[PDB]
Structure formats: C-alpha cells, structure tokens
Amino acid sequence: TYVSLADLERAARDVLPGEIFDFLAGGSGTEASLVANRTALERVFVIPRMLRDLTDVTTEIDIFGRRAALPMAVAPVAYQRLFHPEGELAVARAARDAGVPYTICTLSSVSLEEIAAVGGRPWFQLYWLRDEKRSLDLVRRAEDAGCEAIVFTVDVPWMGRLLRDMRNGFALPEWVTAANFDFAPATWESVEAVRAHTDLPVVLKGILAVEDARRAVDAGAGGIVVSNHGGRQLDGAVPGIEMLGEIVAAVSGGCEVLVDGGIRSGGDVLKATALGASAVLVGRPVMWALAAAGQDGVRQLLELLAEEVRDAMGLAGCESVGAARRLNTKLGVV
Amino acid sequence: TYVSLADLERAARDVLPGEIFDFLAGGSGTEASLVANRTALERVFVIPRMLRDLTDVTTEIDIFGRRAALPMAVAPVAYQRLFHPEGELAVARAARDAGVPYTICTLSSVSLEEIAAVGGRPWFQLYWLRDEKRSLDLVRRAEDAGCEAIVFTVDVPWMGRLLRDMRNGFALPEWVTAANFDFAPATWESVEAVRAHTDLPVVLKGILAVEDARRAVDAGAGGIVVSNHGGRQLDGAVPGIEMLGEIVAAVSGGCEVLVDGGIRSGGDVLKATALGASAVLVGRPVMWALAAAGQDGVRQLLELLAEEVRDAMGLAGCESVGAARRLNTKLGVV
Amino acid sequence: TYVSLADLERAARDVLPGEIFDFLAGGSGTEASLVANRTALERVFVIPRMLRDLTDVTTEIDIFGRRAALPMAVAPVAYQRLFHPEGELAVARAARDAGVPYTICTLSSVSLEEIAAVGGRPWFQLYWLRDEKRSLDLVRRAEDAGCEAIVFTVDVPWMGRLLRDMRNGFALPEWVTAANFDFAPATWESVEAVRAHTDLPVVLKGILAVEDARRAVDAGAGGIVVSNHGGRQLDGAVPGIEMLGEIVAAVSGGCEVLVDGGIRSGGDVLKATALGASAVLVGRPVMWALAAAGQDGVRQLLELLAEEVRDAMGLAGCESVGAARRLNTKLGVV
Amino acid sequence: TYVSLADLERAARDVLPGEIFDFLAGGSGTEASLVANRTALERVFVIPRMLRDLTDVTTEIDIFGRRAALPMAVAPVAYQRLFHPEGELAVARAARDAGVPYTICTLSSVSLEEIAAVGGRPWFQLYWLRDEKRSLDLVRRAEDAGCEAIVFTVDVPWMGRLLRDMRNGFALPEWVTAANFDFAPATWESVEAVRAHTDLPVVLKGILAVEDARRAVDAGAGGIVVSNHGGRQLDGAVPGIEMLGEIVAAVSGGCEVLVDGGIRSGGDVLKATALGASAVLVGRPVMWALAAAGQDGVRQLLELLAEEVRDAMGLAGCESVGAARRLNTKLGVV
Ligand SMILES: Cc1cc2c(cc1C)[n+]([C@@](O)(C(N)=O)c1ccccc1)c1c(=O)[nH]c(=O)[nH]c1[n+]2C[C@H](O)[C@H](O)[C@H](O)COP(=O)(O)O
Ligand SMILES: Cc1cc2c(cc1C)[n+]([C@@](O)(C(N)=O)c1ccccc1)c1c(=O)[nH]c(=O)[nH]c1[n+]2C[C@H](O)[C@H](O)[C@H](O)COP(=O)(O)O
Ligand SMILES: Cc1cc2c(cc1C)[n+]([C@@](O)(C(N)=O)c1ccccc1)c1c(=O)[nH]c(=O)[nH]c1[n+]2C[C@H](O)[C@H](O)[C@H](O)COP(=O)(O)O
Ligand SMILES: Cc1cc2c(cc1C)[n+]([C@@](O)(C(N)=O)c1ccccc1)c1c(=O)[nH]c(=O)[nH]c1[n+]2C[C@H](O)[C@H](O)[C@H](O)COP(=O)(O)O
C-alpha cells in the first residue's frame, strides 16, 4: 500500500484540511531551516562495508536502560487530535506495539496519564511553565504515570513565527484542548531544578552548539537531542545533522546524543547513526501516518521504517547499531 | 496585513510604474552582485545558544555616541519622491518614530535641512562634487542642520551601468529634483578634507577590501559600511556579507563596521551581527513600504523588523546585541 | 544513426514496455546513489596535455593476462532476454567482435556454458548461494566453460528496495528463466573458499571502503570493481568514482582497480582512468543498445564508445591508457 | 541599440540559419566544457579598491612590443564568411579601427594576405599541416604579409566531436572556401621548427596544464593562450579560467599569459586580468556582431566592450591594466 514515506504525505495532504496540513508541514520565517534539514541529510553519503557476518542483524538498542526495537523514538508533536480523533492514543499504541519509545508532549490533546496508560514505556516532553512549582509538578505527574525520561525542550523561550499559520488565521479548534491543564523561558537553573526533582534521565531537546552539549553533560543530562526543532524555531538555525558529528566528539560518551529533523527513511536513520547519533526522533512522518490511517497507519509506517533500517544496515555491512556508528561518510553535492 | 518583507515588495510592484520599480529593484550589468547579496545571506546559518537568561532582551545599540532602537539604519536611497509624494519626509518621520537613524542622501528630492528638521537624529550621505569647496559646504550644511554623521560614499567614481534603466529609457521625471542643488571621484585626499572639516564621525560606505578597511581606520573614519552598493556599482563585486568577517578582524575594534545589501528580515540582521557587524543598512525594503503605504508603511516595516530582530535574538539566546555578535555561524549550501 | 549514448536510451524507451525500462533504469530507495553516479562524473574535469607524439594511439590494455581492445568490459546485467530475444548471446557476440570482455551473470537468461561458447574470452559473475558446495560448483562450471575471471559480487547480501519495481508490480515474465539453475550473504570466508577453488583471478565487485580494498588485496583478489552497484543496492552509498582515487592509492598496484556506475561516454572512460582505474564496466547503456537493435546495436555502441575513447585520449595527449592514468583532474561545480 | 552582449546573440540567432548558429554556438560532446567556461567566470568575484586616483584611467596594454587599446584580441574563428559576406575583412577592419589585434585563421575564408592588407597589425593562427615544409611556408606567408605573432594552435590533433553539427548534417557551403589553400598533429618538435623559422613571437593556444606552460616558456614561446578551445575540443577539459591563476604563478613573468573562453563583458575581462591574464581572446560574441551588422556591428561590440572594461576598471579602483592584475578575487557559489 505504501512503499516510501513520500506517498504517505500525499495521503495526508488529501485527508487533512489545508490549514492543518500547513500547521504540520510548515517552518518558521522563510522556512530556510526546514529545507536545510533535508539538504543536510541528502548531502551525506555512506561508505558501506562488505562481506561481514550478518547472521544476527539486529536494529535494537539500549537507551536509558531499556531496550528499543529501532534506534528511533516518536518526536514530541503537540495537539495530535488535530490529525485524527484518537490523537496521541493511536500513535502511542502503535509506538508500543512497534517497540519504539513515544514522547508525550506537555501540550498533548489527551492527558499524559491516559497516554502513559497505553503502556509501552513512554517519555515526557517538558515545556517550562510560568512558575517553577507548576513545572516540577508536571515532572512529578509524568514520573508517577510511569514515564521513563524527561525530554526537557530548551529551544522555545517562545514560539517561532510560523508564517503559514499567520496567512491562514489558523487557530486551535475548540475540540482540541491542552488536556494536561485546567509559560516562561527556561535556563540552566531550570534544568537543575528538574534534575533535582526526578530520578528519571533528563534529556535536553534543541541543543545545537558544541558548548551547550558540553554544558548539558556537566549539568547531569542523561542525553540531548541535537535539533533545530524541525525548522519551526529560529529560522536560519543550523540543522542538527550538521552539528551532530562535532557534538558527538565533544560529548565523548558523556551522554546519549540523539538527533532529529528531516528523518524520512531507513537510510536517513543509518546516516544519523553513522554520524554518531544514539537514536533519532521522527516527527512529521508519524503524523502523516496518523492522519492517513490512524493507529494502523502509524504501525505500518513504523514497520516500513523498521524494514528500511534493517535493509540499510545489512547492505552497509552492519550487524548491530554500534557497527553502524563506526561507518564513515563522505559529503556530496546537492 | 504584512507578515514578511516578501509581501511588501509585491504591494510595491502593483503601485509603482514598472520603470520606477525597475529603477529601485535593479542592479548593474548582469545583476550578478545583486543576486549574490541574497545568496550570501542564505548560505549563512546561526548556531543558537540555549537556556540563557532572557529577562531584559534589548535590541538597542549605542552607535556614534547615540542610542538606536535596533542595530539598523535606513540606507541612503536617492530621489525618494519617486516612490511616494512625501518622499524622504515620510521615511525620515517613520525612522524617527522607530528610533532608527535615517540617512539623508546628497541626491534627495527634499532638501537636507527639511529632512533633518523632522528630528530623530539623521545622518548625511555625501557624494564628492566637482570642486572641494562645494563638497565641504555640503558637509557644513549637513553639520549645521544637526546631522550626526557624514556617510561618505566612496564606491561611485561614476554610476554603474544599470541595464534595466537603459532598456526602459528611464529618466528622472520633472516633479523629482535634486533639492540640495540650484561630480568628481573621491580619493583618500578627499576623505582627509572632510575629516578636517567636521567634528562629526566620518563613515565610508562601499569598503570591500580588507586593506581599505585598515586604511579607513588609519584615515580617522569613525566607521565604514561594508557594501557593494546593493549590486548597482561594479557588477561582480563581492558581497559585503562575504567580506564582513575578515574586515571585522582586521579592524580589530578600530571603528564601527556596518554592512548592507540584501537585508530582508530579522534573521538577516542576526546573521550580520553574528558575523561581527555593529549595525546594518536596509535600502530597497524601506522604499517598498514607502511606495505601498507612505509613512505608515515604513513605520509598519520598521516595527515588523524590530519584532523579527527581537524574535531572532531570543531564539538564539542573545539578551543583547553584543551577545549576538558572539554567536558562531556555519556556511551551508545554496 | 546514433551520435551519443543519449539517443540510444530514448530508442530503448520506445521499444521496451515501461515496466521493463523501469527495471533497467531504476535505483533503490529515492535513487540518490543512481543520480550521484552521474553527478560525480560530471564534476570531474581533465587537465589535458598538449603537443605529445600521437603516432600510435592505442586504447588497448592487458588485464588478467589478456589483451582487451578498450579499457572496458560489459557489466553483469541479469536476465538480458528481458531486453531482446537473443539476450546474453547478442551482447556476448558483440562484445567478442569488439574485443571487449563480457561478464556472464549468475542470473543469466541463457546458460553460462552457452554464452561462453560464443567465444571472446568471457568473465563469470558469482552470487554466493545457499550452501558453499553449490557456489563452488558454479565457479567450477564457469572455469570449465573457459571463463577467465570470477567476478565475485559482494554487495548484495540481499537486493536493494527497487521502488520503481514495487509500484509496477513487476515480476520476471515466464519466458525469462534463471538458465543456470534447475542464496545467502557472502563473507571473507566465502572469498577464501572461491580463491582456493580456482586458478582464475578473483575480482570483488562492490568495494567502496578503502580498507575493504586493502583487505581484498590481502585476500588474494586479482582485482576489485569499485562500485555502488549502479545505485541499486544501498541508496546513499557513495559513488565508486568518488572513492576511486583513494582506493587506487591504498591498493598501491596490488591488484587491478576497476570502476563502474554512470559511464556514458568516452570522456567518462577517460575520467575514470585519469582517477586511476584500470578499466570500467558499462551496464545500462549496453542494454539500451541490445533493446534497440540486438547484436548490431551493441556492436554500434561498442564502436561508438571505442571512437569516443580514442578521441578523448588523443585530445588529452595520451598515446596509451597508461598515459591517460597519469593525467590530472580538477573538481568543478555541478 | 545594444546594451549588453546578450541582445547581440539574439540578433544573430534570427539572422543566421540555425545550422550556422549551431556551428558557431556549439561545443564538443555533451558541451560540458562549453558550459563550464561560463560557470567559471560567474563564480569569480572581484574585491574592488576604493578612493584611488582615476585621473588617467587607461585600458591600454603593450603586448608583443605593440600598443593595444584594450587587453583583448579577436579570437581565431575559421570561415567567417559563414556569418556575413564580408567575412574576415569586416571583422579585421573593425578590429583595426578599435585598436584591437585580430587573429587570422589558417582556415580563413579570405586569404591571409588580403586580411593583413586591411592594416591594424594582425596576428596569424597556425594549424600544423601534413608536412613541415608547407607549415613553415604558411608561417613565412604570414610573416611576409606583415603579421606580428604566430598563434600556434596546439590543442587540435584532430577536431572534437561537434554533436550539433552531426545532427544537422552541416557541411561547409560551396561559397565558403579555405582561401589560404589551392593536416597532422603538432608536437614540441613542431613548435621548435616554427620558432626557428620566424622572428615573430610564437604563442601557443590551448595550454591548460601548468607543466605545459612551463615547457612553453622553455620552448621560447613569446606567450600562451590558456584555453580549452571554447569547449569544442576535449569535452570535459578544464576551463582556461580555472587554470589561469596557477599557470600565471608557474610562468612567473616568463611569457605573456592570455586566456579565452566565455568572455562576455567588461567585467569578464576584469576578472581575467585580476586572475593574472595579460589579455583575453573573444570569439563567439564577435561573430554575433558580424552576423547582425557586419563591420559596423563588430565596431559597436568593440566599443561597448571598451566602455564596459573602462567602466569596470574604474569602479574597481584601477587606473591601469597592471593595477587590475593586482586585484584580489573570491570564489562564490553558482
Ligand atoms: C511538526 C511539529 C513539531 C513539533 C511540534 C508540533 C509540530 C506540528 N511541537 C510544537 O512545539 C512546535 N513548536 O511546533 C508546538 C506546536 C504547536 C503549539 C505548541 C508547540 C513540539 C512540541 O510541542 N515539543 C517539542 O519538543 N517539539 C515539537 N515539535 C518538534 C518535533 O518534536 C521535532 O523536533 C521535529 O518535528 C523533528 O523534525 P521532523 O518533523 O522533520 O522529523
Ligand atoms: C536601491 C538604491 C540604492 C542606492 C541608491 C538608489 C537606489 C534606488 N542610491 C544611488 O547612488 C544608486 N547608485 O543607485 C543613486 C541612484 C540614482 C541616482 C544616483 C544615485 C544611493 C545613493 O545615492 N547613495 C548611497 O550611498 N547609496 C545608494 N544606494 C545604495 C544603498 O544605500 C544601499 O547600499 C543598498 O541599497 C543596500 O542594499 P539593499 O537595497 O539590498 O538593502
Ligand atoms: C542495471 C542493472 C545492473 C545490475 C543488474 C541488473 C540490472 C538491470 N544485476 C542485478 O543484481 C541488480 N541487482 O540489479 C540483478 C537484477 C535483477 C535480479 C537480480 C540481480 C546485476 C547482477 O546480477 N550482478 C552484478 O554484479 N551487477 C548487477 N547489476 C549492476 C551492474 O553490473 C553495474 O554495477 C551497474 O549497472 C553499473 O552502472 P551503469 O548501469 O550506470 O553502467
Ligand atoms: C567558435 C569557434 C571557435 C573556434 C573556431 C571556430 C568557431 C566557430 N575555430 C575552429 O578550429 C574550431 N575548432 O571550432 C574550427 C572550426 C571549423 C573548422 C575548423 C576549425 C578556431 C580555429 O580555427 N583556430 C583556433 O585557434 N581556435 C578556433 N576556435 C576557438 C576560438 O579561437 C576560441 O578559443 C574560443 O572560441 C574562445 O571562446 P569564446 O567563443 O567563448 O570567446
């Protein structure tokens, strides 16, 4: 029914109201960083290895103590009921059935306790709130509901200027709510409060500067996500993929280094791991599957990605994800 | 009404006679430098910083002793009554209300004494005239009218070959005059005469060679504008943005280093300051706002740019323009 | 009738059912490596030499002890009866008449004994089978039939995901069979078994990593083909042409270094030899000639390539292929 | 009537039979080098100098002892009566009136004695003939007719494959003859014979390798033309402009270094001299002027180029062509 992610997006374009598709597809400003995320992955070529034993090819990884089926998690994407009536529950169920971590947003259209109840060891994405006490109660909620990691999003002191939204007069419909509720910019002091408040690993999403990666490790982060936020925050922010190699070297095994932005295939996952990522986050494509076919859509996308990943690892001579990290790359043209 | 500068230009294209739009939009020769000004800014990506205190984000700067609201001034653009009946007065009033310096041209279609009377601490742009005595009387006029800086334009021994103008038979209409009047190429001797004749800071516009920047500082310039003149002078002249980093390093704090050409957004201002500029000049977009909506148009453009700038600084972790200058960049592709 | 290879392909597009043309033309995944093979050859420019003695310009080479008319062989392409009723026999006859080695596939639609009987010293391309004993009997067959080299294809643990085929529901027609029959991934242990089983030179096709080239030489390979398999295996695998220079230097005369992917002209052959290749393989264009005009088509293509090669060598000042290898190159843009 | 060279070519496209325009416009093979000649000049940007004394801006040069009005000569272009009934005489007259050297071809459609009689100190371009004695008699003819330099073309052991000509069945019409007559590849021995046979400076056209430039100087060449022959010889040969800087450094003042290919404006002339050329050759654009308007056309083109050159030198701060050679450049993108 679907052979690549490309045909998914077309499906979602038909199903969704254009102002919802635009909300999902769009970037900030002139969408330079949105485009650059794809340019970066397309410039990377792999140097595959030949003739290696591929008896037990496995795409599994251990991350934050738990096994995952792929080196991938579902990116935090707010208001998932915009794309399908079951919203976050459809996606979280498909993620659990696929063995892939799911990231519950601070701004989910279903409450985090409900999404966590689905099972499948989920993660919680935090946005720093007005006062510290509410922020730490959010952490506590997610911790009590059984979430396994606090994904502290650090690149949104405020939202980027999403011009597609401005020229649509797009507003949150009234059947979509911030189910976790009945906002202020974070600092390294905020990170310290969260780290002190939880035993869960704390993961900072939106690190792009080598020195912010070093400071994340010193701050006790269990990991970072190297990310320009899908090109929706600072327009002109460097793509995560372009900083990944440097950051991995500076961090020097001190924490997990994830990357997101533009992952559209198993080959892209391979590239990311060959540049040194522990895992990737996938955002928009998961929402395309959700809008096209609900939970079964996302399941199919996750299975198609699982096959593409295992395909690419074997054709490159990698029996484990660790070996994929030891691949070399070469930059190409366009 | 307007979300980016892009939609402004479209507005001005409708309102203006095509031969006036062409006069404003065009470059010299094959317009290679015109295009290259945009290519240069689009190749630059910022490495934003995270989690920094943004309590008092301020886009203000001190330049030539005075406070400015943004790190930006209105570029000198001759014959502004081509674009609107109020011409330079509409733009200067909007500049003053926005806290942004305005550059009165030697070739303004309203006299400099009138434009300065608007208030708002303006600057005077000088073209070297036939004989030294008239040139220095121009300086004296501008100094007496209360102008705060002499912007000595040094890259026009004569005008570039504007081919759009040749193929339109465009000529100055008879309702547009050089209101300052009832021309010869400048040299370093001319700069010295002007410097001796005024206590105002002297700023050389059109410096592109690292060694001309060094000599500007030795000559006593209070600053330079690194500029290929909007691609209207030497076609094939390197973009200012591409020389900015080198020049800033060679000048080593010896004078203010401004840049112009292609600034089209708050992100572009951020890029320029991350490459080391003290401030930028904006030319064509201001004229688009003037032609579309007179003084209120320019006010809106200046406010939209002010928001975009403050947006971009905060998303990049910069509480001051000084911090924006300490950002790193990375060159991308196309 | 035909002046370049370009007009051949058009001819084949008309003659062939679209799902057969797609099977021939297509790559894996998003076809990034397919495209990159052409991008790589188009970025390379030659620095020709002038005024050298061109009395006896000869395109001949000695490879694996035998003389060849051109520094080129026909790439292994399975199921050649898809393109013409005479299939591999038409191509092998044209190859023999042109003095160019022909590579019999494991998956040929005519048996290898028949294709070898055509004459013209052919080569045998091996895919590792289910059990070692069948694999080595294949080698033995080809050796007994008089094949001169075992081209061990090492980059297909399994096939790449050919999306053009998936979206056509393309399947092998019933008049096309694997005539050699009435599959498992290879390892360096497999290479060693083959080397021990034959006195023929063993050539590993699909080497892209410098260290796999070094290991090939240590393994006793008489040569390698530096190849990403025409962009049909790992999508995103670096083009052979981009690794050729490095590999040639690492191998340091230890074995023949061939390259394939994207060769479309005599100039391309020249580029490959200037980067250090001993010879190239040509795949798709030969099938275009086969589909357009059977054996006479391939003969014409081989003659047109022979002239283009000799043309390019002489205009570059090369009397022998050895001299072409001593040419320098320069990388260009797009 | 004409503002740039662009509008000339359009004029010639209308006037000329398409198979004649194609003969003039076309390159060899896939026309990669034809295109690359323009790409190379468009990637080069100048770093202009400011505020320099421009009292006596002069575009004149001394080359081979004689004064020329511009740093430019008309490239050798065979069979000029294809483009206009007056052929080489129209062009040579316009060249003389403009103070620009003219290169008489071995294959001119008017005899060299006639073209030289026009005046204006012309040059003779030599192709090595069947036997040495005829070749040296050609040199002697040109020397006796008063030619001032032997432009020995060294990059045509035979002609490139001009595919536009093959697909037009283009043949020399019967009103166009090789007026110098009633061919064999050259070697360094041929150069030595010519040098011994004439006191005229010998200039080798088609040098692209740094070491061929060194050997040209050792051979006693009074100069070289760094040229890939307008992309009509080896398709894929590096553009002259891309080798010019290296060659100028290796030659180290030992001979004049000219360049051709793609010169289309005064800016292009400036770029070439900033990379170190003594002068350029211009080919196709001169034929466009000849076909559009005969002798007056070429005169207009030469005057338009003279103005563009003087324009560009002054805007870059160069009072002499020597100063233009001391400009720096910067490579850009596309
Ligand atoms: C597409 C998309 C991405 C969003 C997202 C909403 C959408 C519709 N949201 C929003 O914050 C946002 N600013 O848009 C949000 C939207 C509306 C209101 C408030 C917030 C969140 C979020 O909550 N908390 C986060 O940590 N990241 C977010 N991302 C980025 C995502 O997680 C990956 O970084 C990136 O999508 C990888 O790229 P790719 O899609 O190419 O795989
Ligand atoms: C668009 C434009 C730019 C002009 C301008 C006129 C126009 C219509 N004029 C003219 O000299 C000129 N040569 O066109 C002029 C026009 C007509 C007659 C005589 C003179 C002046 C000028 O007086 N004195 C100067 O110092 N600079 C000038 N600029 C360049 C501007 O100040 C910025 O350097 C650049 O515009 C930044 O680029 P961007 O627009 O992308 O922000
Ligand atoms: C176009 C094409 C290339 C094939 C080919 C089939 C086709 C239709 N086959 C296939 O394996 C394949 N995977 O498609 C095969 C097809 C279908 C079923 C099973 C196998 C073989 C093969 O048997 N054994 C090999 O060693 N290489 C193969 N190549 C790659 C070729 O030899 C050159 O490497 C490359 O074509 C140079 O590039 P270019 O064409 O630009 O000159
Ligand atoms: C366009 C053109 C260029 C020719 C030319 C003929 C044409 C129609 N001819 C031909 O040899 C040729 N091979 O085409 C020729 C044609 C037909 C029969 C036999 C010979 C000669 C030639 O006699 N002796 C030479 O030394 N160079 C030649 N060029 C190259 C020229 O002098 C500059 O190198 C280049 O044109 C600079 O580039 P640009 O045009 O961009 O300024």
Author numbering:
A (entry chain A), B (entry chain A), C (entry chain A), D (entry chain A): 2 to 183, 206 to 357
Give sentences from the paper.
p-Hydroxymandelate oxidase (Hmo) is a flavin mononucleotide (FMN)-dependent enzyme that oxidizes mandelate to benzoylformate. Its Y128F single mutant unexpectedly shows a new reactivity and is able to oxidize mandelate to benzoate via benzoylformate, a four-electron oxidation reaction that is typically catalysed by a monooxygenase. In this report, both biochemical and structural measures were exploited in an attempt to address how a single O atom dictates the oxidation level in the reactions catalyzed by wild-type Hmo and its Y128F mutant. The present structural and biochemical elucidation nonetheless strengthens the idea that the FMN cofactor is versatile and cooperates with the active-site residues and substrates in dictating the oxidation cascade.
The R163L mutant (a low-activity mutant) was further examined using the nondecarboxylable substrates α-(S)-mandelamide [2-(S)-hydroxy-2-phenylethylamide] or benzoylamide (2-keto-2-phenylethylamide), in which the former is oxidized to form the latter. When the R163L mutant crystals were soaked with benzoylamide, an α-hydroxyamide-FMN adduct was formed [Fig. 4(f)], leading to the unequivocal conclusion that N5 of FMNox has a nucleophilic propensity and that the C′α—N5 bond is formed prior to α-ketoacid decarboxylation.
